[PDB]
Amino acid sequence: LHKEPATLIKAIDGETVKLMYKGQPMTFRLLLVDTPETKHPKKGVEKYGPEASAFTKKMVENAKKIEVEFDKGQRTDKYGRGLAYIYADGKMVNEALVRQGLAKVAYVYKPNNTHEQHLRKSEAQAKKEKLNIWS
Numbered sequence: 329l330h331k332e333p334a335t336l337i338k339a340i341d342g343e344t345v346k347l348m349y350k351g352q353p354m355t356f357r358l359l360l361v362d363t364p365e366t367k368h369p370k371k372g373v374e375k376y377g378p379e380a381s382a383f384t385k386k387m388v389e390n391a392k393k394i395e396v397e398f399d400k401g402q403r404t405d406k407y408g409r410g411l412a413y414i415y416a417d418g419k420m421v422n423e424a425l426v427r428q429g430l431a432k433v434a435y436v437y438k439p440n441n442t443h444e445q446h447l448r449k450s451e452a453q454a455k456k457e458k459l460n461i462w463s
C-alpha cells in the first residue's frame with residue numbers, strides 16, 4: 329500500500345471528508361468504519377453521530393499533513409467517493425475512531441481489507457473499556 333498527500337477541503341461527517349487529491353476535489357469515504365450518523369434520510373442523528381463528526385473534523389483540521397492510502401481492490405464506490413485509509417499527521421483516522429468507540433468495524437468488502445485485523449484489535453480494546461458506542 330502507499331500513502332499519497334492530499335489537502336483538506338472540508339470535513340463532511342464522521343466517516344466522510346472532502347479532499348483535494350492530485351488537483352481534484354473528491355469525497356473520500358473512510359474504509360472499514362461505520363459511525364452513527366448526523367444526517368441520513370435514514371433515522372436522523374444516532375447517539376454519538378455528533379461526537380463522531382466532531383472527532384474526525386478536529387483530527388483532519390488540526391493536521392499539517394494529510395495522506396490517503398488506497399487498499400488493493402476498487403478505489404471508488406458506486407457514488408463516486410474515493411475509498412481509502414486517511415492519515416492525519418501519521419495517525420490513521422479510521423483507527424482513531426474505532427479505538428475511541430465512535431465507530432464500529434463495518435462494510436468489509438474483500439479485497440479492501442488490509443487493515444481489518446488491526447482495526448478489529450482496536451475495536452475489542454474499546455469494547456473492553458466500554459467506550460461510547462459500547463458504554
Ligand SMILES: Cc1cn([C@H]2C[C@H](OP(=O)(O)O)[C@@H](COP(=O)(O)O)O2)c(=O)[nH]c1=O
Pocket residue numbers: 343357358359360361362405406411435437440
Ligand atoms: C465503505 C463502503 C461503502 N460502500 C457503499 C455501501 C452502501 O451502499 P448503499 O447506500 O447502496 O446501501 C453505502 C454506505 O455508505 P455510508 O455508510 O456512507 O452511508 O456505501 C461501498 O460500496 N463500499 C465501501 O467500501
